[PDB]
Structure 1
Amino acid sequence: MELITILEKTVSPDRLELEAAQKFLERAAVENLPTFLVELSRVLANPGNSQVARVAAGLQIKNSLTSKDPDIKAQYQQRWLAIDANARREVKNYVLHTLGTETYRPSSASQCVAGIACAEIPVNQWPELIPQLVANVTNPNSTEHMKESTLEAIGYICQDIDPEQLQDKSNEILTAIIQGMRKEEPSNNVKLAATNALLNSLEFTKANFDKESERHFIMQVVCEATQCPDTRVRVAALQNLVKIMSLYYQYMETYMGPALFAITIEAMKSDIDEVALQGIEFWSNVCDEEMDLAIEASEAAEQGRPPEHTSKFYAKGALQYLVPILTQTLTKQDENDDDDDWNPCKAAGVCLMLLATCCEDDIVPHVLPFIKEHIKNPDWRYRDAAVMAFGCILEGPEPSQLKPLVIQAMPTLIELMKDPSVVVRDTAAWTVGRICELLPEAAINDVYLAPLLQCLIEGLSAEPRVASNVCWAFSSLAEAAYEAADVADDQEEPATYCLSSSFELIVQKLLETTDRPDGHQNNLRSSAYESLMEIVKNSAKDCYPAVQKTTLVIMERLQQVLQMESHIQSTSDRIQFNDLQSLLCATLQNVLRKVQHQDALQISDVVMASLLRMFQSTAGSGGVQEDALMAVSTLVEVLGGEFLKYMEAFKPFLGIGLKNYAEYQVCLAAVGLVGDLCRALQSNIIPFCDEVMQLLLENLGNENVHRSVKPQILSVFGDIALAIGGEFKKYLEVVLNTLQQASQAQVDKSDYDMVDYLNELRESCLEAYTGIVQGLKGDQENVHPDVMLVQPRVEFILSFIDHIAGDEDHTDGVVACAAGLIGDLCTAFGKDVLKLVEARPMIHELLTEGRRSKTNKAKTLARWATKELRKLKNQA
């Protein structure tokens, strides 16, 4: 049957036709890839075919050539390059002649151009592509459709294909796009097509950026292109201009005044959404990159080196003309306020908030007259921004000089929490919530505490949108109280503080609000539960009965969870169940760490059974059980050496936890659990060591596991020997071979991800050696005869840190444990290691910089290393 009719059916409204066409096209592509693609290219190249069929053919080839998942795309690229050259060149002839034959504003074949070149460019089997496109744009006889179709394909080329493969051919492409970017072009669609393609190729235009004359030529276009009457060209040129600022800030100085800053202020005055948004977005990036450069400036200032890059303080010299317009457009809110869509009203706040952080203390006088004047406006519009802008400028200025403004406005804030305007009450909740986090002392004042605290309690009973914003205020208020409680009340744990009077009232209210049916709205339940976690975590000694009651209540909440595992009928129900189970287990961690040892005995059996059944309740959904076993560890951390009552009923679950090999997080937590087990059970873990150790060594051999879990797996080997003592000799030979092999692996220094990955890897290697040395050392007596088993390896272990000392990447964590290990090695042998260390002077310079290291534990291990080194030298 004719394939032209097939292209029509894939767009016709019929379900049976869609699957039949998809099956036939997929089968034919696999059956005969070269011939069928040639047939497809022949049909689309014909201008006489219907445009609908040509669009369908374009997307079908686009779907076959490219996809969303990179791995699927990558293997398709390999499949395409295996096709013979004549068939590959045959479609190239039709594709390069198909453009300009379609009246559609977008070009169907442009997507096809991108897909084929995804594999052609890396293999360089189509070298005449780029020169061909340049001639098409430069040709004055070209039609409008052919001009834009080529530009549309160009944008796709630089957006899908990897930037490295297009580094060399940047000069020719930029010459073509500028030719079609001239303001003399009559058609507006050519301008926007050139603008879209230009922004997609800014990542490899640096070869053209170095030429100042060319750089002035390129910016000469966009400055003139911004003044285009078409609104789409206005935003697109600005959007391209935004990305130009983001990359080449080091050289935009000479034109910001005469050319750039004039447009941005004008573009920000637009009554249209996008035009003002992009202008707001533009100056937000200026402050953003200013901050990162300020970070670089701060980094270079402390080191004493000159800053490799230097800013010019654009934000400070523009806020005079930025604040009044930004504040004016901050009042463009609507009655039907929604958080789903990004709008210039909310865009105004974030840019204003970013500006305050960037300019620090030079925004206070420019905003205070506006807020102080419109805070009494009869209409909620001006009162909304009078309080919203107050909170948006709270960060960046120093608290002491901002105290006089916040203290006098606080009596107004509580009254503003009562006006019938819904948005103002929602807005006020954030401001009081923000003021608690950033200003602890001001948020707690007895002249205003009692009215403020009462308003907060009444507030959460209102609509969820204001209940969510006030919950975080409650949690921060407790933390602010705690920061003020440890100073006044006791030194290690508070006994009774200010919030304790209303503590028992508010905690049960938080229990009440978690029961509200609208807990899903504005993540109310997760907001309250997290607030509940913090308020229980931060309590006073007189609140023990209060935390005792909710501990029983949350146990009853666990009982509710027990008998609802059969209520799953929808996926979203399980998702909330997954969220609910994680919150309660997380809440268990807070309460179990804030209870009495005696009180833990009664709850031990019920929780252990509950945790056991909840582990097996979730046969699937591995995410929730990640929180389960770490919650189990928290019980062990507090229960003590009385957890042996459940060890025999925990080994199959502990064993199967390490038997996953699929998710790295569970086994990453599992190796913590066994580390937590041996750290508390002490010498009673001997009968359980054989089962885990055999399985644990299997994880080392398999390399299909994630790279991140490997250092943690090696981390647990050292500590288990510290508990048992000198009973680990039956596995000592096996681990050293794996430790030998793991230490052999090395990688180059080109990508910072793997460069810092080996740092923590060798960090885990060091601490593993410390544990076995300390484990065989015993408790207080001299070196056991078991030390001779690792005696031949001490040269290799010192050799491994010899390479680390010779490296220059380094990490404060790495240099710490190495110093500690040296003391352990000095205790192990002493005089024997004296000859070994003298042959390696790089460890001497590695320990001297330990004094330089600012971390205190580095200092303690540094002095530990050098004190024993002197004793070895003074031994004889």
Structure 2
Amino acid sequence: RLELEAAQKFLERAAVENLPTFLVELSRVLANPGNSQVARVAAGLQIKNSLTSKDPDIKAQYQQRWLAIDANARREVKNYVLQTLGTETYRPSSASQCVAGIACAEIPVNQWPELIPQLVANVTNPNSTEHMKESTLEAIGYICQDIDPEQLQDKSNEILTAIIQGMRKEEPSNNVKLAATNALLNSLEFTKANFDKESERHFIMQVVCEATQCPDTRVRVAALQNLVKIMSLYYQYMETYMGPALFAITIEAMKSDIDEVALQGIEFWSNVCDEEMDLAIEASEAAEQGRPPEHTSKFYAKGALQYLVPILTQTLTKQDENDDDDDWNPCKAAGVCLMLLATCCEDDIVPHVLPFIKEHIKNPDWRYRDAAVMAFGCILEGPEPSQLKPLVIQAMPTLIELMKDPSVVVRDTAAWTVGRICELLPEAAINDVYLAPLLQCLIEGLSAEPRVASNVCWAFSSLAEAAYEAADDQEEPATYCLSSSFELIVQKLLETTDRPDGHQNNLRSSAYESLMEIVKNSAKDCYPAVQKTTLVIMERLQQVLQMESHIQSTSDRIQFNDLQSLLCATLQNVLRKVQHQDALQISDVVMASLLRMFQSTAGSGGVQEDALMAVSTLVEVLGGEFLKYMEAFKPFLGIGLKNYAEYQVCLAAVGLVGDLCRALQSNIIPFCDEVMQLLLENLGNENVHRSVKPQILSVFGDIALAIGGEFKKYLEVVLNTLQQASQAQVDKSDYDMVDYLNELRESCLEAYTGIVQGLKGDQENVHPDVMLVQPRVEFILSFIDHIAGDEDHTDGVVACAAGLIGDLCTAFGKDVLKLVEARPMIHELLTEGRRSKTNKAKTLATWATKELRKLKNQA
């Protein structure tokens, strides 16, 4: 490091004091083949670091800083940078990155029109040396990579010829070919007009296919990578080449003993599967239920299925009794490809893979035995479950013994297959023939290696839902097929939870997910155990937080938040289904977990909304005696309301305040002052998402409805706030803003309503307090008048406008009617609500009409 400061900032007191002078002197020591290869690259690295960055915004800002330098300085920079190509005889070169750095800034503003025709010239020139054509193709590659293809469309055919000339078989240097073939990979986007003409297309494909035959494997892989890209970009043009060329190339590639070549051949067909599944959806959806496709599938994968499958299953043998993950070898690639083929080819996949399975499931060589159970599991999704069920039956007890195989990788594959069966086709599991022995097999599996046990946890989760939905899924069933095993499965899962190697293969987290999954998916006769289990889960997840929160990685944090989020839903599940007295029993512990989930967790998260939703559930079940938790919940409710960033949390918290209003009623008064301040602040903060404001306006009514005359403190500011919100205008030719206008109107009307009702009282006649809102009645009805003549209002707005008219009649009487008949548009609105298909708008408009009638008769 001792010579680092004298460099890594000695070259920064220049780049900020005088960046022009800096970049010019660096380019000089780059352009001269006399200085060290180290200083040369350092210079180039300094220039490149001055023009671009991984952060798209500082890149966008480093570019503007370049387009600000004196044009004579930059032209000096561009002169030495460009004149370096061919001079460097080391590494891929540093100048090529400088070319593209500058170019990505200057090209989109038409500031270096000289570059591209000059770069084409470097490759095209027959005098040009190896290093000249090589470095130039690389720069071309970097440019096409880092720039928008829309900014190169007029030079596209110049770029292409330079690349093709580098890829041609005649070119003696494979280094050039590799550089050119890599360049083509980044420039297939703007050769669209070429590929569209047949004779033009033929030549491109010829060069690429020819390049896959190059005795250099780098050129092979690169060209094979191009074929994968070409299939995605120009799928509708490969019928010509698949037969005579593309089949043989990729097929032979899959069989290569060079892993890099094999992975590209496999990726070709995996990619075809992705295209042809996406077409299978386009042909299925919108199509037929609208006009038919519109991009038809040529079914390349279906058609090659008979020569792909035997190659793949053989590749499933080529494994490591070790590997670690994520290891990406042809063996693991072959399995994923087979899976994609099954979901793409469906039933057609079955008779090609089945003779392999039935011939190797008992082979003494473990790599062949592993491959068989693996191939079996790969095809379980896609084919009809009809054809599939009597087939796992053959293999099920074989799967069960394979769980106790002497090879660790067969054991692991068997468990994945079982778990895959339990999720996709649990018929073989939830069956009187194999259920009990499979459970024993699973119970034993939790004691196995973490890689196996995690798969078992998965299988348990899938079995619990399958069992729950199977007779006899609200309302809850009295018993299910896991009832006589429930307490045993739970304690086995809890044992797994406390394993010293629980950190491996997400074992511990998977078991916690299984636990919560069986708690949710359980029958009524499991409830005493469900209740205890729920308590245990909460105590231990608390321990995990208190003891491990500070040492969790980014991935541990995503899992733990996922589990806490799951715990919330689990707690909501339990609290809604158990006897009310039992919910009271555990509600103290439930509240503690939820309160621990707030903003402490997490840095990357969090789960505040999930937790607020669980509190809402506890509020709805307890209601009034939730009051005991109100003092402890207060700060966390406050956190939710101040979370304008995560606006979804804000919404849930605001909604929760309304739920607390209906539950605690007048008991919420001690807590209203702070809540009202928070809500009011949220309104006077333009950094808040607009979707929370109407919900806040609504809750004003809920709060007023709960505390009655105590709301007088807030009347002035609230009523005036409602006045500005009611006067809102938007562009009527902006459907999003019109929908937001209606949402705001509906909440304004709701707010007025709850304030009128809340100040009125429940008894008769009206409390004097309501008279404080009377001066607003004319504006309120004037507000409804404008809504009436807007035509773009919704039936949800008409409903609330009607409900308010009915409430004003009861509160203020005769005065309301004089104001209403002076605005005949109001009666138009009430009629529209009276003649409505919306049940809420028809009742309220009728009620409002009735009340208006009484006022007239009472005159």
TM category (shorter chain) comes to 0.7 to 0.9
After TM superposition, the score normalised by the length of structure 2 is 0.83
Change (3 A) 1:76 1:769: farther
Change (3 A) 1:406 1:751: farther
Tell me the CA shift for residue 38 of structure 1.
Answer: 0.6
Q: Which moved more, 1:468-477 or 1:277-286?
A: 277-286
Q: Which moved more, 1:842-851 or 1:437-446?
A: 842-851
Tell me the CA shift for residue 854 of structure 1.
Answer: 16
CA distance in 2, matches of 1:267, 1:114: 33
Q: Highest Rg: 1 or 2?
A: 2
* Matched length: 859
Equivalent residue, structure 2, for 1:220: 206
Change (3 A) 1:385 1:825: farther
CA distance in 2, matches of 1:810, 1:320: 61
User: Secondary structure in 1 aligned to 2:286?
Assistant: helix
Q: Which moved more, 1:226-235 or 1:765-774?
A: 765-774
CA distance in 1, matches of 2:813, 2:255: 76
Tell me the CA shift for residue 252 of structure 1.
Answer: 2.4
CA distance in 2, matches of 1:765, 1:278: 61
Tell me the CA shift for residue 847 of structure 1.
Answer: 17
Deviations 1:100-154 (A, max 9, x none): 1100240211111122222212322222111211221211111111111111111
Equivalent residue, structure 1, for 2:249: 263
Structure 2 contact 513–563 (Cα < 8 Å) conserved = no
CA distance in 1, matches of 2:793, 2:252: 50
Tell me the CA shift for residue 806 of structure 1.
Answer: 15
CA distance in 2, matches of 1:803, 1:292: 49
Tell me the CA shift for residue 470 of structure 1.
Answer: 0.4
Change (3 A) 1:786 1:854: same
Change (3 A) 1:376 1:81: same
Structure 1 contact 529–583 (Cα < 8 Å) conserved = no
Deviations 1:448-500 (A, max 9, x none): 11111111101111111100000010111110100113xxx396111122210
Q: Which moved more, 1:772-781 or 1:178-187?
A: 772-781
CA distance in 1, matches of 2:802, 2:522: 40
CA distance in 1, matches of 2:320, 2:857: 81
Structure 1 contact 568–574 (Cα < 8 Å) conserved = no
CA distance in 2, matches of 1:523, 1:541: 30
User: Secondary structure in 2 aligned to 1:318?
Assistant: helix
Aligned positions of 1:222-621 closer than 5 A: 222-485=208-471, 489=472, 492-554=475-537, 556-557=539-540, 560=543, 564=547, 588-608=571-591, 612=595, 615=598
Q: Which moved more, 1:530-539 or 1:546-555?
A: 546-555
Structure 1 contact 371–390 (Cα < 8 Å) conserved = yes
Change (3 A) 1:722 1:240: farther
Change (3 A) 1:644 1:42: same
Change (3 A) 1:740 1:465: farther
After TM superposition, the score normalised by the length of structure 1 is 0.82
Structure 2 contact 580–621 (Cα < 8 Å) conserved = yes
Equivalent residue, structure 2, for 1:861: 844
Deviations 1:585-630 (A, max 9, x none): 6654554445432123343345545655675866977636565544
Q: Which moved more, 1:624-633 or 1:26-35?
A: 624-633
Q: Which moved more, 1:823-832 or 1:134-143?
A: 823-832
User: Secondary structure in 2 aligned to 1:847?
Assistant: helix
Structure 1 contact 562–610 (Cα < 8 Å) conserved = no
For structure 1, which runs of at least 5 residues remain unmatched after alignment? 1-14
User: Secondary structure in 2 aligned to 1:642?
Assistant: helix
Structure 2 contact 315–334 (Cα < 8 Å) conserved = yes
Structure 1 contact 537–594 (Cα < 8 Å) conserved = no
Matched, 1:163 2:149: yes
Q: Which moved more, 1:591-600 or 1:106-115?
A: 591-600
Structure 1 contact 391–435 (Cα < 8 Å) conserved = yes
Deviations 1:16-40 (A, max 9, x none): 2223311111221011110111111
Structure 1 contact 80–119 (Cα < 8 Å) conserved = yes
CA distance in 2, matches of 1:144, 1:492: 77
Q: Which moved more, 1:410-419 or 1:754-763?
A: 754-763
Structure 2 contact 647–692 (Cα < 8 Å) conserved = yes
CA distance in 2, matches of 1:271, 1:806: 77
User: Secondary structure in 2 aligned to 1:647?
Assistant: helix
Structure 1 contact 558–584 (Cα < 8 Å) conserved = no
Change (3 A) 1:611 1:210: closer
Change (3 A) 1:737 1:280: farther
Q: Which moved more, 1:456-465 or 1:200-209?
A: 200-209
Tell me the CA shift for residue 503 of structure 1.
Answer: 0.9
Structure 1 contact 711–764 (Cα < 8 Å) conserved = yes
Deviations 1:147-175 (A, max 9, x none): 11111111111222334433443233223
Tell me the CA shift for residue 348 of structure 1.
Answer: 0.7
User: Secondary structure in 2 aligned to 1:622?
Assistant: coil
Deviations 1:669-724 (A, max 9, x none): 43343344345445654554453344224334434356786787678668767877
Change (3 A) 1:865 1:117: farther
Structure 1 contact 170–208 (Cα < 8 Å) conserved = no
CA distance in 1, matches of 2:832, 2:208: 52
CA distance in 2, matches of 1:313, 1:838: 70
Deviations 1:374-423 (A, max 9, x none): 11111221221211111111111121222221222222221222222211
Structure 1 contact 62–111 (Cα < 8 Å) conserved = yes
Tell me the CA shift for residue 187 of structure 1.
Answer: 0.7
Structure 1 contact 830–872 (Cα < 8 Å) conserved = yes
CA distance in 2, matches of 1:458, 1:851: 66
For structure 2, which runs of at least 5 residues remain unmatched after alignment? none
Structure 1 contact 170–207 (Cα < 8 Å) conserved = no
Tell me the CA shift for residue 194 of structure 1.
Answer: 0.9
Structure 1 contact 380–421 (Cα < 8 Å) conserved = yes
CA distance in 1, matches of 2:222, 2:321: 30
CA distance in 1, matches of 2:389, 2:138: 56
User: Secondary structure in 2 aligned to 1:593?
Assistant: helix
Equivalent residue, structure 1, for 2:50: 64
User: Secondary structure in 2 aligned to 1:25?
Assistant: coil
Structure 2 contact 806–851 (Cα < 8 Å) conserved = yes
Aligned identity (percent) is 100
Change (3 A) 1:137 1:634: same
Q: Which moved more, 1:678-687 or 1:728-737?
A: 728-737
Q: Which moved more, 1:815-824 or 1:192-201?
A: 815-824
Change (3 A) 1:79 1:856: farther
Change (3 A) 1:189 1:710: farther
Deviations 1:305-334 (A, max 9, x none): 132221122222111111111111122112
CA distance in 1, matches of 2:49, 2:573: 51
Structure 1 contact 114–153 (Cα < 8 Å) conserved = yes
Structure 1 contact 391–434 (Cα < 8 Å) conserved = yes
CA distance in 1, matches of 2:174, 2:405: 51
Tell me the CA shift for residue 190 of structure 1.
Answer: 0.9
CA distance in 1, matches of 2:509, 2:669: 42
2:168 paired residue among 182, 186, 203 = 182
Deviations 1:505-562 (A, max 9, x none): 1111111111111111001111000000011112222212212332443454367468
Q: Which moved more, 1:130-139 or 1:301-310?
A: 301-310
Structure 2 contact 558–604 (Cα < 8 Å) conserved = no
CA distance in 2, matches of 1:829, 1:424: 81
Change (3 A) 1:376 1:121: same
Structure 1 contact 136–142 (Cα < 8 Å) conserved = yes
Deviations 1:338-388 (A, max 9, x none): 222211111111111111111122112111111111111112212212111
C-alpha RMSD over aligned residues:
5.7
Change (3 A) 1:370 1:739: farther
Equivalent residue, structure 2, for 1:3: none
Structure 1 contact 479–538 (Cα < 8 Å) conserved = yes
Deviations 1:778-808 (A, max 9, x none): 9999999999999999999999999999999
Tell me the CA shift for residue 641 of structure 1.
Answer: 2.3
CA distance in 2, matches of 1:222, 1:869: 82
Structure 2 contact 708–758 (Cα < 8 Å) conserved = yes
Change (3 A) 1:157 1:475: same
CA distance in 1, matches of 2:188, 2:831: 46
